């Protein structure tokens, strides 16, 4: 739903990044090597790979040389990528019309560190993965940091300055780790198309920046007051995720020397299906998406036998307390090129 | 898989001799070495450590930067020197899996003998099944069967070789191990004991009215156990690879270090059921499988006194030609 809208918004940035690769004759290499990192997109992963497939086919059809092939690395691969495998594998598709063969591989492991040999990647795509951290900020998980962000699970208006500082610091570290890892693996002049969950305002405590996590904390606090969750637990737990601003992303990429910013863009989208007339169906659909992306870290924290009652309260807060309206979600599009190198 | 365990110890010398022959050429100071395990089924995780161990030794002798190792795994069923990255490759190994010129090494153990399908031409005209009472080449079976089977294996193995030809780099190495046979006649008990016995078990249930004969008569396994000569000829017909070594070795089929025949027979049947039931179950259901391998075990433990012929494995070492 929302994911679909984000994916289409980033598609032109993906096209141009392929175009730039062509201007450096990447289409004349024996094979183009593409990776999709954090394949949790996705469904929307099929569109981006089909798009690379198609742009190569258009480019190479007038070339006298033997037609280049496409090698696709998919990471997150949980064996459910079979729908993408069967849809993109040119041997499985069996289309004799296609001149560009596509070979699809699974890459196990974390997008945070190394996944491939040196100079093995020409193009990296990653959508809504890079804002995830390796852990809750270290300054928040020390013996005395467990006390800083009391009734919440993320940067909030109630958070002392140390909280957002810790998060930015953790992001700086984890994102630089990523950049460093990719820098080893992305070929000189290679491209990277990153899309992530960010924010508009410079202040992270702003609702538009934190609403999803703020509302979840309010829901957890409800069950806490009702005596169903230990609060222990609320006060010591913080989310392993950060939504940076444009400026923060720029800063970190520029401090790291490895990549050049070809494109840095933010854009806003509605956070719920505003075309939906049923105020309950609107929030329920939103909550379902939220649950799909957040239940792993959350149920791990509070147990699974409380996830139903928890996400129900979350939906009730969205529907009733907020009249099925939320601030708009900001997404960041970051296109990078590996410097030579 | 205590049997497989013994097979991989015997082919590991032939794996070392071959991987090291990729160090005689250079082929020594490259960025990253790409190796594929095609039809994996812990031994695939053993051949990986072998490659890593060998590479690190040849580099420390050559005083050069250590390449990284990328391993591709196509599934059918701290102070380490060489950086290894492992990748999963879905898809059939009889077709293309990799870009051209991308593999330095290919390993495949006990997968190549599996056919893409049970042989095509097994019905006459008339309109009779050409392999009644059985599920593989047998003594009762007319010549047409073993010819259909060899033809199917010819086609399938040649497709494999053909695909690999595109992907294996010039002078790149292929190590293939497969279930073969000693005797030139593929209907010898040495060649087909497992399938023969399985048929005998099924035919027992048929006479008891538990399984249609329909059924037995129209089913045949998607497997073929070739001879050294058949393997050699097919490889030579295809023009892509050089036969560096081609050798067969014998192995005891049952755990013979066990005096209790019914125990060593069960162990055998348990093993046989693990790799044959998925091949058999579509045609005969899972329902009758308990009574099927029950009867199979009695045919093994009683009628043959837990004495089965040795299994022949073929070790095939290849090099890409240009």
Numbering used by the authors:
A (entry chain B): 29 to 104, 106 to 370
B (entry chain A): 28 to 68, 71 to 106, 125 to 369
What does the publication say?
Here, we identified three N-methyltransferases involved in the biosynthesis of caffeine from the leaves of Kucha. The structural characterization of CkTcS identified key residues around the substrate binding pocket that are critical for N9-methyltransferse activity.
We finally solved the structure of CkTbS in apo form. However, when overlapping the CkTbS and CkTcS structures, most residues lining the substrate binding pockets are in the same orientation, suggesting that substrate binding does not induce large conformational changes in the methyltransferase domain. The substrate specificity of CkTcS proteins might be determined by minor variable residues which subtly tailor the chemical features of the core catalytic scaffold. Further observation identified three sequence-variable residues around the pocket: CkTcS_Arg-226 (CkTbS_His-226, CkCS_Arg-225), CkTcS_Ile-241 (CkTbS_Thr-241, CkCS_Thr-240), and CkTcS_Cys-270 (CkTbS_Ser-270, CkCS_Ser-269). In CkTbS and CkCS, Ile-241 is replaced by a threonine, and Cys-270 by a serine, both of which contain hydrophilic side-chains that may introduce extra direct or water-mediated hydrogen-bond and influence substrate binding. Single mutation of T241I or C270S on CkTbS led to a moderate increase in reaction products, while the double and triple mutations further increased the N-methyltransferase activity to almost half of that of CkTcS.
